[PDB]
Structure formats: C-alpha cells, structure tokens
Amino acid sequence: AFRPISVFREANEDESGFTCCAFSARERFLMLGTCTGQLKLYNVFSGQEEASYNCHNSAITHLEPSRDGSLLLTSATWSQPLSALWGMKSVFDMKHSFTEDHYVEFSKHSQDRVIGTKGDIAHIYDIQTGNKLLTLFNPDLANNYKRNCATFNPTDDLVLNDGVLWDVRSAQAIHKFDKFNMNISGVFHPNGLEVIINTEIWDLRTFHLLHTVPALDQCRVVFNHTGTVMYGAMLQAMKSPFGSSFRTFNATDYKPIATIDVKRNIFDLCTDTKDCYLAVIENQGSMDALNMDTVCRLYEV
Numbered sequence: 001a002f003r004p005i006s007v008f009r010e011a012n013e014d015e016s017g018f019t020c021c022a023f024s025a026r027e028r029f030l031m032l033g034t035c036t037g038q039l040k041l042y043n044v045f046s047g048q049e050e051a052s053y054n055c056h057n058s059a060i061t062h063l064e065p066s067r068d069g070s071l072l073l074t075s076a077t078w079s080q081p082l083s084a085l086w087g088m089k090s091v092f093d094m095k096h097s098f099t100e101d102h103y104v105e106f107s108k109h110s111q112d113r114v115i116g117t118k119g120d121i122a123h124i125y126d127i128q129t130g131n132k133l134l135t136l137f138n139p140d141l142a143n144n145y146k147r148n149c150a151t152f153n154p155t156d157d158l159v160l161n162d163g164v165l166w167d168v169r170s171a172q173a174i175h176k177f178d179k180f181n182m183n184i185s186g187v188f189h190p191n192g193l194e195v196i197i198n199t200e201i202w203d204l205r206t207f208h209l210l211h212t213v214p215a216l217d218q219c220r221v222v223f224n225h226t227g228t229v230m231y232g233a234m235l236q237a238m239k240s241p242f243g244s245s246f247r248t249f250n251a252t253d254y255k256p257i258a259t260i261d262v263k264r265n266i267f268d269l270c271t272d273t274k275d276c277y278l279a280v281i282e283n284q285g286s287m288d289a290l291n292m293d294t295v296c297r298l299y300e301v
C-alpha cells in the first residue's frame with residue numbers, strides 16, 4: 001500500500017499553487033514549482049517552507065534536479081524563456097536559458113548536456129557553454145506527435161525524439177518507430193534494452209514489438225531510481241496535466257501492480273533517491289475543480 005505520511009500546501013498563499021515537484025539531494029526536502037513561477041524548498045515531513053526563489057513569470061510545468069545537487073532545470077508555460085538551467089551552489093542563479101524549448105531533461109549517464117523539446121524538434125545543449133550543439137529533426141521520418149518529449153537513453157549515445165531513434169555521435173536517425181497514437185512519443189526503459197512508446201514496447205536491438213500494454217495509453221511514465229517500478233498517469237485531453245489516477249507496473253515484466261485513484265486531479269509525482277517515498281501534487285476539492293488550490297501529499301511506498 002501507499003501509506004499517507006504527510007500533506008501540505010503552499011505557505012502564505014490564499015490559493016496554493018504547487019504545480020510540480022522533485023526531491024532535493026537533501027533528505028527530507030522537496031523542491032516544488034508553483035503556478036506563479038516560483039521554486040520552493042519544503043520540509044516534506046513537517047510541511048514547512050524553507051526557501052523560495054523566483055524562476056519564471058508563468059507557471060512552472062516541470063523541473064529536474066541534477067543528481068549532484070548543483071543544477072536544476074525548470075520549464076514554464078507561456079514565459080520567455082520557456083526553460084532554464086539554475087545553479088544551486090552559493091547563490092541561486094540562472095546559468096543558461098533555453099528560449100524556445102517548453103521541456104528539457106538532463107543527459108543521463110554524465111549530466112553534461114541538456115536535451116530540449118520544441119514541438120517535434122529536439123535541441124541538445126552543452127551545460128558549460130549553453131551552446132546548442134545539435135538540432136534533431138528529419139522531415140522524412142517525423143511522426144508529428146502532439147505531446148512530444150525528446151530524451152536521452154541511459155548511456156547518452158541515443159536520443160528518442162518524436163518516435164525516431166537518433167545516434168547522437170553521427171547525428172543520424174537510425175530508426176523510425178511506426179505511429180500508433182496522436183500524442184505520446186515515448187521513453188527508454190532504464191535497462192537500456194527497450195523503448196516504451198505509448199502502449200508499444202520495442203526491443204532496441206531488433207526493433208521488434210515485444211509487448212503491448214493497453215493501460216499505458218496516453219500516459220506519461222516515470223521509473224523509481226532503482227528501476228523496479230514504473231508509474232504512469234494518463235494525460236487529460238492552470239489545468240491539471242493528468243486525471244485523478246496513476247498506475248504502477250513491474251518494470252521487469254510490465255505486469256500491473258496497482259491502480260491508485262486519488263479522486264483529485266494530479267499535477268505531478270516523484271520518488272526520493274532511495275525510493276522510499278512518493279510525493280504527489282493533487283488539486284483539492286473535487287474532480288476538474290476550477291479553483292487552483294493544490295496540496296503535496298507524501299506517501300511511503
């Protein structure tokens with residue numbers, strides 16, 4: 001069971017505007033983005049605010065801390081710039097911005113690059129210089145996914161963009177995965193062997209279809225750090241990205257574990273580095289509430 005541990009809202013706000021979250025390198029502290037563009041650090045057990053930083057002029061949609069704790073990526077809705085990289089050393093400071101990309105991720109093995117997405121286009125940037133190294137787009141192989149997000153594989157050699165597998169070194173598209181849906185572009189399994197594109201699981205060696213998993217339709221997915229569990233939540237067609245439910249799956253065989261309906265719209269979820277806890281941002285009140293008034297709920301896995 002997910003055992004509820006704590007709940008909290010954004011402090012000194014009439015309406016709570018938490019939108020996204022990620023655990024910090026510090027045990028007990030969660031980073032939360034807000035609908036007015038702030039980044040907050042909270043004690044996840046006591047629900048107390050520790051620090052606040054001004055990041056964007058619009059809602060933070062997504063964020064991602066580097067493992068070493070030194071760097072943070074943020075993305076926003078209708079700001080310019082849409083994404084940015086922040087230093088979390090002495091002074092919280094913007095290192096680089098990514099004017100055109102509405103979503104960004106770090107490289108996975110060595111976190112020296114950022115991959116950004118604009119529509120069906122991937123951009124790869126050097127963290128040090130901020131320089132754009134590669135643009136990845138092939139008009140001949142595009143799938144035109146509506147909710148595309150470009151991503152590196154575990155060893156940083158490959159990129160999946162718009163259902164197309166790219167070799168990063170040669171900057172060549174090596175395979176296009178056929179389109180089976182309008183929206184979801186897919187991710188790499190942390191095992192480095194499989195690609196998960198909506199309901200289709202592809203073998204990365206053969207490009208053969210390994211499994212079909214209907215429950216993953218229209219889902220964003222995230223794995224726990226140890227790569228044993230996969231969380232999925234179905235996108236909706238300051239509105240929540242997701243519905244009221246998320247599902248877990250065994251990462252080794254894609255078998256369903258649990259379906260969790262929180263009966264409230266979900267904005268985000270994340271696990272801690274040790275995969276003990278799950279933090280979920282949920283809107284209070286009722287399904288599809290108009291009022292933006294989110295809480296963070298912490299569960300023990």
Ligand SMILES: NC(=O)C[C@H](NC(=O)c1c[nH]c(/C=C/C(=O)N2CCCCC2)c1-c1ccc(Cl)cc1F)c1ccc(F)c(Cl)c1
Pocket residue numbers: 019020021035059060061062063077103147148149220221222231232233235238239240241242246247266267268269270
């Ligand atoms: N942090 C993570 O990576 C976890 C991940 N979060 C997001 O994917 C996410 C989390 N948030 C968003 C946007 C938020 C957004 O667009 N808005 C609209 C304006 C008001 C704020 C929310 C997204 C998101 C939506 C679409 C796209 Cl294609 C890209 C995305 F990143 C997740 C994985 C599995 C899950 F079960 C859950 Cl509940 C969450």
